């Protein structure tokens, strides 16, 4: 059978999701439990609020090689700068943040688009973090085959500073170093320490942000102006 009459979204995506371990992550694509029933709060317990992290000093640097195997459901993280990935280890689309969301598709090997539903030996997602001021995106997230969230973006921005739990800033760590922003230090969907870029599959990737409230924000990157929706809570 052919791919489609073009249909450049049903093809060009990695539809290889298996859950023999009944975690029920494809079931929660329709509904979502409360912040309590989903059992996030103990998951959220291990990362602390932005208030008491540390104080940044002097200039700014860059760092990579971080990344503790977990689910990135927190405002801080070090997404371990991205690279090419096969199409057999990805479930669902791959939204990469310009910050304006962009859906990346399967690119065969070097630069060849493919339309085999992402199931072939060579079908591969060629996503490479690079600051949009020099083209490309900041970073992006997707769910691996078995049903775990994964993320990867530009070299996770450190904030010049130290502590017992120094922050490997992935986004807009303001009031610590007044240079962090989603143009120099931003990696993933998290525009600000308390809300992500709103895209259709935001809740699925982060299933315990249900109590977040929509909001309209705008910012200029490179030579373009972006009108975007950010879903923030509390603030």
């Amino acid at each position, epitope marked *: 059978l052919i791919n*489609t009459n073009g*249909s450049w*979204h*049903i093809n060009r*995506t990695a*539809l290889n*999701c298996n859950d023999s371990l009944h975690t*029920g992550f*494809l*079931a*929660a*694509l*329709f*509904y*979502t*439990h*409360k912040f*309590n*029933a989903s059992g996030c709060p103990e998951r959220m317990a291990h990362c602390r609020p932005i208030d008491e992290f540390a104080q940044g000093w002097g200039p700014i640097t860059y760092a990579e090689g971080h990344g503790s195997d977990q689910r990135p459901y927190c405002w801080h993280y070090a997404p371990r700068q991205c690279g090419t990935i096969p199409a057999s280890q990805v479930c*669902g*689309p791959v939204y990469c943040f310009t910050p304006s969301p962009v859906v990346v598709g399967t690119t065969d090997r070097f630069g060849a688009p493919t339309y085999t539903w992402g199931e072939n030996e060579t079908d591969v997602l060629i996503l490479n973090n690079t600051r949009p001021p020099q083209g490309n995106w900041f970073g992006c997230t997707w769910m691996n085959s078995t049903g775990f969230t994964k993320t990867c973006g530009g070299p996770p921005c450190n904030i010049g500073g130290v502590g017992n739990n120094t922050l490997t800033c992935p986004t807009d760590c303001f009031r610590k170093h007044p240079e962090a922003t989603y143009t120099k230090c931003g990696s993933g969907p998290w525009l600000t320490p308390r809300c992500l870029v709103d895209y*259709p*599959y935001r*809740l*699925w990737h982060y*299933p315990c942000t*249900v109590n977040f409230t929509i909001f309209k924000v705008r910012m200029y990157v490179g030579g373009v102006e972006h009108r975007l929706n950010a879903a923030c809570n509390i603030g």
Partner: antibody
Amino acid sequence: AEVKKPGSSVKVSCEASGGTHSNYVITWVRQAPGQGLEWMGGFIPDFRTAMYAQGFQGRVTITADESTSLAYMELTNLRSEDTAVYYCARGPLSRGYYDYWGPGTLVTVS
Amino acid sequence: SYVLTQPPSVSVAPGQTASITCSGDKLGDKYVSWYQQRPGQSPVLVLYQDSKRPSGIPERFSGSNSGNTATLTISGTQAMDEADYYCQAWDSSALVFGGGTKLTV
């Protein structure tokens, strides 16, 4: 619609056009005359996955196309208990509530 | 399985308040939405996320959910608020529709 002779098939064309289309979960609901609603299944245009109702785990069969229509079911083996009005709704991705219920469709069987 | 319970019918006088209860097992942790269906019409969403309401719905409509019960409170009833109301919840990859409570003024 006329009587679909016992042991037939029926298609429910949802003519589903609501909100932002692709990123909007389709669904289906069946209401018997004066008996309240009951679920039948769901569907997602991007992830070609068709969740099934436990009571209708066998007969419900979802097939659709990329366009704003052609999304429907195929409920076979009609029986008197299947006489009802079917409504198509289009909710957001994972909020749960089914906003913008569509016009109903009556189905009868002898 | 899961079961949601609501009173069969309610009767009130004009301008007064009417309360409809949808009760279930540990329903305080399941999001509940309220539908209103007039005679021979496709339902319409009047409340979602228990308390929140969509645009185009009067502020008179109110709802809440806690413990094991969810209430739909309407203040100042009139002949234009006579219709069945249904309570909806999601449980264990299944959709549950509570019983219909006929409101008559």
